[PDB]
Design a protein around this ligand. Sequence first.
Ligand SMILES: NC(=O)c1ccc[n+]([C@@H]2O[C@H](COP(=O)([O-])OP(=O)(O)OC[C@H]3O[C@@H](n4cnc5c(N)ncnc54)[C@H](O)[C@@H]3O)[C@@H](O)[C@H]2O)c1
Ligand SMILES: NC(=O)c1ccc[n+]([C@@H]2O[C@H](COP(=O)([O-])OP(=O)(O)OC[C@H]3O[C@@H](n4cnc5c(N)ncnc54)[C@H](O)[C@@H]3O)[C@@H](O)[C@H]2O)c1
Ligand SMILES: NC(=O)c1ccc[n+]([C@@H]2O[C@H](COP(=O)([O-])OP(=O)(O)OC[C@H]3O[C@@H](n4cnc5c(N)ncnc54)[C@H](O)[C@@H]3O)[C@@H](O)[C@H]2O)c1
Lengths: 337, 337, 337, 75, 319
Amino acid sequence: MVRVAINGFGRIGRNFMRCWLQRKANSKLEIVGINDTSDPRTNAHLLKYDSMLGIFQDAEITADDDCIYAGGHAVKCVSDRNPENLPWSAWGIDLVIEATGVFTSREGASKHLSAGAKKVLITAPGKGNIPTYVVGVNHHTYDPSEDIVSNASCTTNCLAPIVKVLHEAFGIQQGMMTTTHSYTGDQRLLDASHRDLRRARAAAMNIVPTSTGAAKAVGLVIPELQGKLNGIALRVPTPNVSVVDFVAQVEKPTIAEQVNQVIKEASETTMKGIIHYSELELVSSDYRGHNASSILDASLTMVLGGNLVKVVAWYDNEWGYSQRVLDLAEHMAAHWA
Amino acid sequence: MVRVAINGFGRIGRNFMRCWLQRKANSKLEIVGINDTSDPRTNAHLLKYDSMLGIFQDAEITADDDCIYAGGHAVKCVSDRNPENLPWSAWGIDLVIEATGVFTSREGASKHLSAGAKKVLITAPGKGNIPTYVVGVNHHTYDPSEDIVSNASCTTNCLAPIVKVLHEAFGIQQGMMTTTHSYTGDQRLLDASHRDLRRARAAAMNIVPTSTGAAKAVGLVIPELQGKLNGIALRVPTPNVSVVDFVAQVEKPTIAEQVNQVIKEASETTMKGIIHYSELELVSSDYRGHNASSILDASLTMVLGGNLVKVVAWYDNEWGYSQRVLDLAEHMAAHWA
Amino acid sequence: MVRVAINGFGRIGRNFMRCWLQRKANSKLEIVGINDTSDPRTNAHLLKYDSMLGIFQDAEITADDDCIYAGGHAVKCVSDRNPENLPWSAWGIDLVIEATGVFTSREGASKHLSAGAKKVLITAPGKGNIPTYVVGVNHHTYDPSEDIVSNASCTTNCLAPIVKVLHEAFGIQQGMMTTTHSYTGDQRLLDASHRDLRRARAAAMNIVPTSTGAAKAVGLVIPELQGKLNGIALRVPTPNVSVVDFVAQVEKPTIAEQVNQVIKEASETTMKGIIHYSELELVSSDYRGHNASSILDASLTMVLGGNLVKVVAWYDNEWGYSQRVLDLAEHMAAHWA
Amino acid sequence: MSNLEKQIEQAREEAHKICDTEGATSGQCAAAWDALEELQAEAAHQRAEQQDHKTSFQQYCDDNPDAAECRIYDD
Amino acid sequence: RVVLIGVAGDSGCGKSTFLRRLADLFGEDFMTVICLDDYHSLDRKQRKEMGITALDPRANNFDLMYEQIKALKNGESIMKPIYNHETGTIDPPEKVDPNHVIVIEGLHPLYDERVRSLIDFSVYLDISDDVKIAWKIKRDMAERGHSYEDVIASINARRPDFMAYIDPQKQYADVVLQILPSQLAKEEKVGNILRVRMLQREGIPGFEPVYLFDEGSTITWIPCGRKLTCSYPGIRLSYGPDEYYGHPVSVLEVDGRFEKLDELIYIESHLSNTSTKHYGEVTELLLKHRDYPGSDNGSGLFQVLTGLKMRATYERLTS
Ligand SMILES: NC(=O)c1ccc[n+]([C@@H]2O[C@H](COP(=O)([O-])OP(=O)(O)OC[C@H]3O[C@@H](n4cnc5c(N)ncnc54)[C@H](O)[C@@H]3O)[C@@H](O)[C@H]2O)c1
Ligand SMILES: NC(=O)c1ccc[n+]([C@@H]2O[C@H](COP(=O)([O-])OP(=O)(O)OC[C@H]3O[C@@H](n4cnc5c(N)ncnc54)[C@H](O)[C@@H]3O)[C@@H](O)[C@H]2O)c1
Ligand SMILES: NC(=O)c1ccc[n+]([C@@H]2O[C@H](COP(=O)([O-])OP(=O)(O)OC[C@H]3O[C@@H](n4cnc5c(N)ncnc54)[C@H](O)[C@@H]3O)[C@@H](O)[C@H]2O)c1
């Protein structure tokens, strides 16, 4: 049993905690420590009453000022912004889950390793050559001495299994993407001062575009496509779920039905539990809480000229990404060294 | 002076009326008739108090049950759903502006021609071989005996000048597009019964995808690219403005700066007043009421592998499209036959 | 067992069907007929995938063009706007549930009685002296020969139990209310033509005010307060749940804690299952799907001058109102005559 | 169908009569069976059009298209 | 310009799915449909009085149809009469206009020789009598009219003049599609799986043949094997040069039932001169309508192949 911790009890942290509360019996992981910038009275309320996933129902949530009782299970909790003053060796922490969006560097994330933690899994595309791993693509090829691992962004975590399937079946020369992304917490609500100008504007009002390198992270997790994948993101006023457009330029020519057939059988042989395949005419809010990290929308797949394919993929960047974080954490627990 | 009329006093009709009230002096057009399914008391209020363009300020709006006084200028108004019972020859109508979204066929739109109107300009991609014309691409090449002309959709009206510039400068083999579209009036507000299932769902809540053929209408207005352009649309909860992504596969290789240079000089030589060029980091709501039919967003243009270009274009599908409708109407007034 | 039917498979109809699917075993009601203006293929999809209550999970939903199989249970379905051409006696219908928002008159609703139905329960404040009944206030005092009964609006259905408790405990001279109401389907999405001008404007953008007489319907269901209760409504851009403010002028003086005590014990003795009492600092979206028809918000109750009380009540106007409709339907099944 | 419903059985009676009586192999009763097959063909054309009977949408949007149930702004 | 397409068969005018596949290919904007039962001389009353079928070269005004057909080339809107089908009578005519593509289809689209000199591309569509019986059993079984098994005796009574009147037209058509009972499958009803073959004619330029791996050497190919897991019974193609009625033809022939996708793209990757601007375009045109009758067998393959050759002839005629 592996004692794990959570740095930053935000959206990813609350979803990680809720996922572990829903996957408790099959777990080699026991969540024993969290730390947020809030007191332990508030974040227990925010855990129980999520305005996106409704009221939690299965287990009882309560807290006092030093611990949080989730379903009778106790969990410790502290508050500090310095990662160096944190009781890790005092709590016996193998794996800490970096989810603050602050400690993306190696030198930032390694502060927990210095302060007495054994491995760190950071839920962000980290700066510098941090080894990145996506469940369903290359979650096998990590060396267990790599204590500082990184899951990529949610967009990369959705996009990379589709790109893996299409690269194996057809071969990819180039590829664009344009993810229509739900608004995240970084954007200011009204027009307030912010480091980047396109995130400074109002979130509920605007399609704000942004440039991301998270398309290039597929070139990290798939090495032979690096420098060939690039794309932008569009933040639109939907709170939870998002869709990603993906334009690839394959070289083995095909039609629109065949790529759907390929991804449909890949959903049932290898990418089971990663890619779901849906031939329904659903819309965005029917994917709040879906377990797969990419639902391929079947009716919109199209091929022009044989060698130019477009797919779109629904994905929940708050629930499915947390599911892949927890699956990667359990998969590194199963190969603990 | 050409006596013109408006069928359907909806969003496009109110914006057309507001544009003509703002471009009155240079006009060979006099708006003399409208008809909506509402009484003349209500739609004058809806003209004066638009919840998108604010309160109209320049001229006074009032009405009684038979006429509407806009700034002292009188305009007639009636209400009928049958186009065959309409006083056109009784009012002396050269050009009627079809804007109901109902009469897209030739046989539907020709009912006004039968009922006593001389020309009809329909603001929709019509079914059947109706001659379509976009201002800035092929607004010259219409024969003035073509009395039933069609402006295309707003997405096509934005996209086609960019595709014209890139086809002339580089040559296009294939091309995709994915417009992130503002929600239109066709979608039901709550989940209500509707002919298409993806428009049946809630508009304020959801990214609803839809398949459109309005990308193929570029292949109508540019003949040598027909069957090479296709794309989908994403309706997101923004009320007014929208952005269109466009992925082309050019064959003359280039870089990202050069296509920006080409479109920047095309903004100043030929597409002046059609395409604006913006090197600012703006967001969506800074294009409410912009006069150009496509604002090219400069910072997001990218080229992979030399022969694969992506541009994005802001465009207002309620104001700029009305501007192009009124420009096409004046341009057919200037070549009246 | 009572064979029942649903006129208009909209929000109230889909919620009624979902409630009966969740309360099947304790039911003397079997839903055997629905009719909407849509085909039976579409509304089964809209039943299964609600963008407000998520995907339905307990039973399987499928359909063909003549029947709908909900969890193996078959239900008939037809489409007609004329209520006079409907197979009621051909289907053996005791109670039809009017939920179109069209047939509010006695002469409109009695068309089903003429066409071969035995009782009609209309889910709207009907025009004319239709006997209105609220579960929890006067659901006992209906005569079973009254075949045309009316449940009131959702605002009245929330407000009247609180007014009953405060009138019994303190006595009410006068009373105002101002319900902050979620947007309903009647409002146009963009600024479109509509019979009332304040509902003609955009729903996602605006606090639109409206005048309602649904406060006066408390004076129907409580007879000694008629002509003493009046209030307005505010429609704000939230899709599901709403809150009602209520200012009463009591005459027996008291403090803010005592009215909370009165309503708390009334929640546990008489209004159990009608009024829930919450001393949490919750917000709106934590009441999506709550079973009570009024959650009294405890922290905001205030009394000025002893004789002037203000309460606020959360209530879900799409789920709890459907629950009260189904409870009234079962309660008229239990006293069938 | 009632008219052609009767007329097919009438021509079937004639097919039993004229091609047992006035020559089983000649142009007359071959014209009779050709007629009965055309009656059958128009029964088939009636049958396929009644298979394509729309339920509601190609009626309510046939007569009144701009209602909110079938506005399509294919844009 | 005016182009012209002749279709021949007794599948009912406008009552066959080949016109539906042409509609999916061209569009009813670019083409118009002309039935040819409209040019009947007189009615079923006069058919009973004259003792004559609807197949007689007396029974049609073959000259006025020629005058309208020649006036179609000159651009003017033609005025064609209409056979009132329920009564057998004749409507006063309708004024219809020419289009980009004009089709002609009926029992005698090709019996006249001046219009045989006029038609730009011709298709006969043959049916064997067995699947005639298997389609009439479905005709009187789905309708439940209870008129079966003497329609068997209507078949051979309809037969002899039909072979005199209609079947010598196929000696002048370009492409003729025969549909046979399947030699491959035996334990079914006699109309499930078809053995279809499109005898196409060499000579007249613009029309290429579509040859399987070689022009002019008979080759019977079964695509089952290392890359396709065939179901029962799978496909068995054919090909062969031949001389039908003393004319250089090239039969391309398919027996089997298409059960899935990869076995229908793998066949299409190996046909040649199929005149596509688009890879797999024939498979897309198969699967734009999964509900059409005969999509699962070679009939839907051959019909869209002929229509694709009609695209080729149209592009040859319009440059
Ligand atoms: N938002 C998403 O859906 C999503 C999806 C994928 C990945 N991510 C990544 O997850 C990370 C966090 O996302 P989020 O939505 O939970 O962020 P958030 O800002 O909503 O929550 C982060 C939490 O961490 C706390 N925190 C910040 N710095 C801290 C520090 N130094 N010490 C302690 N607590 C600290 C914040 O105050 C807050 O409580 C970011 O890297 C984000 O890019 C987000
Ligand atoms: N919404 C946009 O921003 C946009 C952009 C480009 C093009 N268009 C096209 O413009 C058309 C109308 O758009 P809109 O937003 O104004 O539509 P709308 O539905 O908001 O308004 C249309 C108006 O016409 C009325 N109307 C409908 N049928 C009528 C009839 N038979 N007789 C009289 N009045 C009738 C409606 O009741 C309403 O008043 C559609 O074809 C749409 O696709 C819309
Ligand atoms: N919206 C709410 O939350 C709420 C709450 C309480 C009461 N109500 C009342 O419930 C009623 C319906 O509410 P809703 O949101 O379901 O309405 P809705 O408009 O969303 O759905 C009504 C359904 O009935 C159909 N319909 C309308 N007229 C019809 C006719 N003549 N024949 C057949 N079908 C017809 C509509 O097309 C639609 O399918 C209204 O009286 C409303 O005031 C609504």
